[PDB]
């Protein structure tokens, strides 16, 4: 069974199975783990770089042109949620990294100023791996970022926000939203850090350098973009009876959505409050009830996060009150 | 464990004899060999070293001990280990061309002696393809990462071999020249070599040829040729090295390893071809001391008759066989 087929992150494939008169739900969320694998760019493109330029040509000529086809082309996706945040600065960021001009930079972000954040993230991630998806359906070779080769030995990644405790960098809880990091000239990304690991621990800002500075910022942006794509599909799924009613009584799907939102719970305030609530209800909530938690999570009043002191322990992001642990975030695979 | 050839790169080994049920069992480790062939996948060769900062090199350089293992890490000429003089002139100007570095300190890789360590050279060029330039001073400098090195980093198996034309059709041909004789004539003899990479998906390295990737193809082939030369140089020296050979003289398990090692270059080097052929004839049950007598005959065209041997490529394996018998089976190299 297909769940959310016209969606980049929420595209799923569930398989109901009856064994010994006990039902078992096995969920597959390939689009999500495909988009998070952008955190290791060389691995994201390691198989596609050998398919050849032919790959793109076949997708473009097909008349159906579904969202999965348009995502592979790093193009705006009709029939799927899109955004407008800092589209002006997003387009000139394409033109800066790829050294391409304005006229056909509009072909990624049109005059509508609407783009698919994950389709944008795919474009920039492939560029860091050395492949530039062009306006025409072609692969063009661009310089491979050193940072992308540095990080390709890592298997675990943990983004989080930081602040100063007096000459010491300490984790701070997400107060802004991920979208609000794309403005002010992307200068809000300096307060984000991804801790890569091999399970040895290496923070991405520890590797900061004049040579690697550009690669650091793009990689952070792609994570922010994948977070926006996630919010946009989570927001749209709520107002989508067609798909939500299909998974309405699949409680196993709540752990997956929680697992997914957990990825951004350290950098997005809405995903922070959303995951907190579901840990309170012990993650045993039917899908339809889950999205009311997603919809309340949009209000600063929904959970009391001010009294929550967070600490970083053994590659896990702990958010906990003195009484008990409220939320454990685990590093995302690849 | 017990150390074998500790002042060598490709042949550095560590053996541990263990007696179980009053039966002795030998466990052999040849780290230097599999470290040098891992250069066939450059990004993987440097995937762990790129995280260590330049301070690493300084710690090894400041040491006055200056052993061969230390000097290999510095991509420097190695005293106390065999070195070569073949096309040293063109090897140095190839350093200066790829790294855009000048002549004066290009001599510091290949001195006025014109002696160099082929594996130290292979390490220098392999690290460059992974984006890191080992400098004359102990420092890591960032150089453009070769696209080809990223292309090949999904592959797990590699099989070098020599090629020829069958009338508009590329066919495998047996090694008639030595690997060294592929570094001369401006390195134009490498156009007859091909490496079939695979994921066991099969991709020949010349299928990926392009103006953008042309340099990367040639450097990767050269490093394989260089690692083969390093192997010959240590194999030649081991024969006249009683100190080490007598320690492992009766270790028949060591014969499979040397055969497994020489098999890697048996497809592009004529000497390694005849050497591996011989040991397959004696069913690979040869004591180490006798093995290196076979290695010494292998240097002569007359030792085995290879002219009647038609070679073919079967499911990613290099078959050399005629009549009704498989004379040599070469398997793809891991990583
Ligand atoms: C954490 C502090 C700011 C003080 C603070 O805690 N405010 C949080 C807040 O903005 O609310 C910031 C400001 C200057 C930053 C550095 C500079 O921008 C330079 C450089 C930029 C790099 O993107 C990440 C490393 C770092 C050293 C940055 C680390 C860190 O990002 C710093 C040292
Ligand atoms: C932070 C990185 C890298 C900076 C650098 O080269 N190192 C400086 C250092 O190490 O001191 C830069 C590279 C190109 C920049 C972008 C481009 O110039 C285009 C555009 C320019 C605007 O003034 C600010 C937004 C932004 C998207 C820029 C954001 C950000 O400013 C980028 C993505
Ligand atoms: C095998 C044939 C030559 C016929 C032959 O067998 N003569 C051997 C001989 O020279 O004695 C050569 C000539 C043209 C070569 C190609 C061109 O030089 C272009 C290009 C050059 C690259 O170095 C390796 C790949 C290849 C496609 C080459 C593959 C292969 O190297 C070819 C197709
Ligand atoms: C074959 C490759 C790549 C050629 C290329 O850019 N593509 C051409 C194409 O695709 O037609 C070149 C790049 C630099 C060359 C070397 C440098 O020029 C230095 C030096 C120059 C000598 O004339 C011949 C030996 C060699 C080592 C050269 C061997 C070989 O000639 C190299 C290693």
Author numbering:
A (entry chain A): 19 to 217, 232 to 366
B (entry chain B): 18 to 217, 232 to 366
What does the paper say about this structure?
The mammalian orthoreovirus (reovirus) σNS protein is required for formation of replication compartments that support viral genome replication and capsid assembly. In the case of mammalian orthoreoviruses, two nonstructural proteins, σNS and µNS, initiate VF formation, and σNS recruits viral RNAs into these compartments. Our crystallographic and biochemical studies reported here provide a mechanistic understanding of how σNS forms filamentous assemblies by linking dimeric units through domain-swapping interactions of the N-terminal arms and further how such a multimeric association is required for the RNA helix-destabilizing and RNA-annealing activities of σNS. An important finding from our studies is that mammalian orthoreovirus σNS has RNA helix-destabilizing and RNA-annealing activities without requiring a metal ion or ATP, which makes this protein an RNA chaperone.
We observed that the native σNS-R6A crystals, without Se-Met substitution, crystallized in the P41 space group instead of P65. Native σNS-R6A crystallized only in conditions with bile acid derivatives in contrast to Se-Met σNS-R6A, which crystallized without these additives. Structure determination of native σNS-R6A, using the Se-Met σNS-R6A structure as a molecular replacement model, showed that native σNS-R6A also forms an antiparallel dimer, with two bile acid moieties bound to each subunit in a groove located near the σNS C-terminus (sites 1 and 2). Binding of bile acid molecules is mediated by hydrophobic contacts with residues Thr 107, Glu 110, Leu 111, Ser 114, Gly 203, Leu 204, Tyr 240, Glu 242, Ala 245, and Glu 246. In contrast to the Se-Met σNS-R6A structure, the N-terminal arm is disordered and not observed in the native σNS-R6A structure. Instead of the distinct helical assembly in the structure of Se-Met σNS-R6A, native σNS-R6A dimers crystallized with bile acid show sheet-like packing. Further examination of the structure showed that one of the bile acid molecules occupies the same location in the core domain as the N-terminal arm required to form helical assemblies, suggesting that bile acid competes with the N-terminal arm to disrupt the helical assembly formation observed in the Se-Met σNS-R6A structure. First, the σNS crystal structure shows that the free N-terminal arm displaced by bile acid is disordered, as the electron density for this region is absent in the presence of bile acid. A fascinating finding from our study is that bile acid derivatives bind to the same site in σNS as the N-terminal arm and impede the RNA chaperone activity of σNS.
